[PDB]
Amino acid sequence: SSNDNIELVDFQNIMFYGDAEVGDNQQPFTFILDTGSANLWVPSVKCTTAGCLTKHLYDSSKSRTYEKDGTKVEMNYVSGTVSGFFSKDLVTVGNLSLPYKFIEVIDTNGFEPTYTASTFDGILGLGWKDLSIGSVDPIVVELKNQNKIENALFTFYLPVHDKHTGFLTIGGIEERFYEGPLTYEKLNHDLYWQITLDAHVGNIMLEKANCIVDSGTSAITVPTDFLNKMLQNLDVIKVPFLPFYVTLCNNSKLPTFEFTSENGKYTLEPEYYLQHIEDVGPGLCMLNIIGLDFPVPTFILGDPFMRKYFTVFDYDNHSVGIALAKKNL
Amino acid sequence: SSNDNIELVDFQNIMFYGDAEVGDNQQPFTFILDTGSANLWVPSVKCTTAGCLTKHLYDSSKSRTYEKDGTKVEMNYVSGTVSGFFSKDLVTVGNLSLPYKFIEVIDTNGFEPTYTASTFDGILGLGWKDLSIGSVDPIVVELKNQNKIENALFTFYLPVHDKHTGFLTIGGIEERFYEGPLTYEKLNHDLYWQITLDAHVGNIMLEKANCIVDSGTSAITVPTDFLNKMLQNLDVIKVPFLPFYVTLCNNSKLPTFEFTSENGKYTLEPEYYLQHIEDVGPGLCMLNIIGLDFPVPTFILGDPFMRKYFTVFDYDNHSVGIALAKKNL
Amino acid sequence: XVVXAX
Amino acid sequence: XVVXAX
Numbered sequence: 001s002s003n004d005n006i007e008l009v010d011f012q013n014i015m016f017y018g019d020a021e022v023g024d025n026q027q028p029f030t031f032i033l034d035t036g037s038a039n040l041w042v043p044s045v046k047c048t049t050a051g052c053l054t055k056h057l058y059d060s061s062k063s064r065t066y067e068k069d070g071t072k073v074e075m076n077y078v079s080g081t082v083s084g085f086f087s088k089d090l091v092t093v094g095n096l097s098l099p100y101k102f103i104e105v106i107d108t109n110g111f112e113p114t115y116t117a118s119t120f121d122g123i124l125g126l127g128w129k130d131l132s133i134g135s136v137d138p139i140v141v142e143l144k145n146q147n148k149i150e151n152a153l154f155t156f157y158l159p160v161h162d163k164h165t166g167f168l169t170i171g172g173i174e175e176r177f178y179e180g181p182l183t184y185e186k187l188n189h190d191l192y193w194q195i196t197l198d199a200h201v202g203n204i205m206l207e208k209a210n211c212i213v214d215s216g217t218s219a220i221t222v223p224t225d226f227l228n229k230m231l232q233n234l235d236v237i238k239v240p241f242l243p244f245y246v247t248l249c250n251n252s253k254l255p256t257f258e259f260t261s262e263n264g265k266y267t268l269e270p271e272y273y274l275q276h277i278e279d280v281g282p283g284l285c286m287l288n289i290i291g292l293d294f295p296v297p298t299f300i301l302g303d304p305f306m307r308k309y310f311t312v313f314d315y316d317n318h319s320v321g322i323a324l325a326k327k328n329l
Numbered sequence: 330s331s332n333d334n335i336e337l338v339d340f341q342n343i344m345f346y347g348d349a350e351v352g353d354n355q356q357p358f359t360f361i362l363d364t365g366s367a368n369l370w371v372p373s374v375k376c377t378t379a380g381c382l383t384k385h386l387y388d389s390s391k392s393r394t395y396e397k398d399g400t401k402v403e404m405n406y407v408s409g410t411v412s413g414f415f416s417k418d419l420v421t422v423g424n425l426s427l428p429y430k431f432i433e434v435i436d437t438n439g440f441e442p443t444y445t446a447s448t449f450d451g452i453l454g455l456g457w458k459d460l461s462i463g464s465v466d467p468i469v470v471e472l473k474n475q476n477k478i479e480n481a482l483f484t485f486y487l488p489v490h491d492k493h494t495g496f497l498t499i500g501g502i503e504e505r506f507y508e509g510p511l512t513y514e515k516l517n518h519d520l521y522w523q524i525t526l527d528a529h530v531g532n533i534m535l536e537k538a539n540c541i542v543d544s545g546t547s548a549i550t551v552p553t554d555f556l557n558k559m560l561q562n563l564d565v566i567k568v569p570f571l572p573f574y575v576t577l578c579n580n581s582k583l584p585t586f587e588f589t590s591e592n593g594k595y596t597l598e599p600e601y602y603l604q605h606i607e608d609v610g611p612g613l614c615m616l617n618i619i620g621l622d623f624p625v626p627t628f629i630l631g632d633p634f635m636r637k638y639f640t641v642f643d644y645d646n647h648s649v650g651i652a653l654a655k656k657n658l
Numbered sequence: 659x660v661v662x663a664x
Numbered sequence: 665x666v667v668x669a670x
Contacts, residue, residue, distance in 0.1 A: 012569065012570065013569075014569065014570060015570075015666065032668055034668035034669075035668070036667075036668040036669060037668055037669035038669065039669070050554065075669070076669065076670025077667065077668065077669050077670060078667035078669075078670065079665070079666050079667045081670065109622055112553045112620070112622050113553040113556075113557075113572050113620045114666060116553065116557070117572075123668065125669070127669070131669055214667075214668055215668060216666070216667075216668010217666065217667045217668050218570050218665045218666045218667075219570075219665055219666075219667070221667060224379070224380075224438065224441035224442045224445065225379035225441075225445075227442065228379070228442065228445055228446075237606075237608050237609055238442075238446060239604075239606055239609070239615065240340070240341050240343055240446070240604070241343065241344070241443060241446075241447075241547050241659040241660045242571070242573060242615070242659055243442070243571070243665075244568060244571060244573060246609050275569050277566075277568070277569065279566045279575075280566055280568075280575050280609065280610070280613070281609060281610040281613070284609070284610075286568070286569065288569075288570075290665065290667075291441055291442040292667070293438035293439065293441060300667065302667075344660065361660075361662055363662030363663075364662070365661075365662040365663060366662055366663035367663065368663070404663070405663065405664025406661065406662065406663050406664060407661035407664065408659070408660045408661045410664070443660055452662065454662075454663065456663065460663055543661075543662055544662060545660070545661070545662010546660065546661045546662050547659045547660045547661075548659055548661070550661060570665040570666060571665055617659075619659065619661075621661065629661065631661075631662075
């Protein structure tokens with residue numbers, strides 16, 4: 001070894017969590033590690049809302065390195081909102097640590113039912129500074145600026161439920177996690193980990209699509225028009241008014257997503273975007289895809305993409321590295 | 330006869346639509362007639378979004394009665410957002426007509442994929458003035474102020490698939506639509522059509538709950554905590570990472586809602602609220618009870634409630650009248 | 659699901 | 665589903 005690793009455990013076969021600590025007394029929390037945001041938050045002992053009941057809670061009084069701030073702040077995600085106030089304390093990811101500005105959340109009611117239905121405590125953003133609220137330098141950037149890691153990069157190797165755990169690796173790239181070569185794609189903006197790829201599924205093509213690589217999204221997210229055309233004659237049932245797309249798992253018509261650049265070609269076959277729902281009915285699957293429109297046509301390459309492809313998030317070189325993940329360690 | 334009636338058509342026993350016209354020429358449109366909002370909007374001919382390409386579009390240059398405004402408006406709903414600009418024109422509802430402020434929508438992507446998947450063109454709000462954007466007096470209020478109708482009230486007899494069509498009746502109450510007594514519940518606020526009822530499912534009780542009677546909602550919506558307690562008494566199948574559940578339609582343990590006031594008792598059995606998904610499996614249903622947290626503990630009595638109960642929306646007396654709907658006309 | 663205004 | 669920042 002040489003790089004620091006946070007072990008990742010799957011949540012309900014699609015998302016994944018990892019643990020980190022806040023305070024000089026190493027108060028532990030379970031996090032969604034989220035390349036699609038850029039703020040760290042943990043629920044406070046000062047939380048009053050029902051969603052905090054089952055959570056680990058941060059107690060600033062128990063940490064000598066706590067530094068008061070108290071600036072109020074609301075953190076908004078596509079899926080919900082939490083609010084509280086800024087604080088500063090030692091954040092420990094792996095056995096790397098640094099003083100860090102984060103949000104003590106005291107109100108989680110804007111993040112229900114998700115928060116209560118889930119077993120994470122907080123979210124640890126891994127995006128770029130401009131995506132942050134409160135102008136926070138990213139953890140991995142600060143760590144390299146303070147010379148605590150070799151490279152301002154991190155790496156995701158996602159867990160698979162029955163097979164193996166996953167790792168968030170900070171500071172370096174480990175060959176054990178992927179097969180074949182890494183291909184690098186330059187960021188089109190330092191905001192999300194967003195790259196430009198042609199997106200192809202049917203005879204449907206969206207050239208130069210904005211593709212966000214987002215560990216904190218459980219699905220593949222697709223422009224609504226693209227999705228509608230995708231599903232035309234696919235024998236997929238959209239349950240009226242629900243983003244719930246049901247198919248025979250062995251539906252021969254299900255296409256393969258193909259995202260291409262000059263550098264590389266990344267595909268997502270049905271086996272990666274289908275989720276079994278045998279308890280709903282025999283041989284049934286749902287498409288783990290949703291339609292979502294951004295100002296610019298955008299795909300979120302969420303967990304289903306990252307489950308197939310090992311990913312490198314390189315701040316120094318402003319790029320995402322992609323390689324086929326090893327099926328087994 | 331003698332009241333203004335607008336025929337209503339069912340969509341999969343889950344929503345309903347009615348037609349109205351805009352401009353002095355015909356220009357027909359299909360609307361969600363929505364007691365939970367207070368604005369009228371139609372997709373403009375200036376809308377080039379993929380959603381609008383499948384819709385009947387409003388051309389303001391084809392109407393002499395049109396008068397420009399152009400003030401930018403964003404309309405927000407729980408289920409999405411559309412944007413455009415205010416216009417004014419002759420809005421014809423049934424055989425009645427009046428000059429009226431409405432929105433020409435030019436962006437619909439924040440309302441996808443529901444907009445494209447559905448066959449309605451726009452939404453006609455039937456709420457109170459304080460709910461509107463641009464302080465628009467409700468159509469029915471203005472119609473009674475202009476002496477086109479006897480009473481500032483409207484009435485909903487919802488269609489039931491394979492049984493009968495329905496009607497939105499403006500100006501008066503017709504006995505043909507219901508059996509037994511009407512019971513009037515006073516509004517707790519002039520905003521939504523919102524009344525106070527004790528809501529109970531067994532020992533799960535929320536006394537003096539805020540209950541919004543909403544024709545534009547396809548589910549029964551309950552506080553998330555309330556849904557969680559109800560789910561403890563069921564063995565339904567949760568859809569992976571979605572707040573939706575699958576059941577056999579004949580699951581005898583499915584809850585019957587009971588809503589009680591000093592004046593009346595209302596019940597809603599599974600036969601009314603479940604969403605059938607026969608195209609996924611025989612006798613399969615979505616639970617169609619959705620957790621939704623308002624600042625105040627709130628139930629939305631959506632279409633499922635209104636399919637069972639004929640409803641009278643009385644501006645003059647600030648009340649909702651409730652009676653058992655006739656099973657067939 | 660659909661839930662209609664804020 | 666879940667989609668993580670605005």
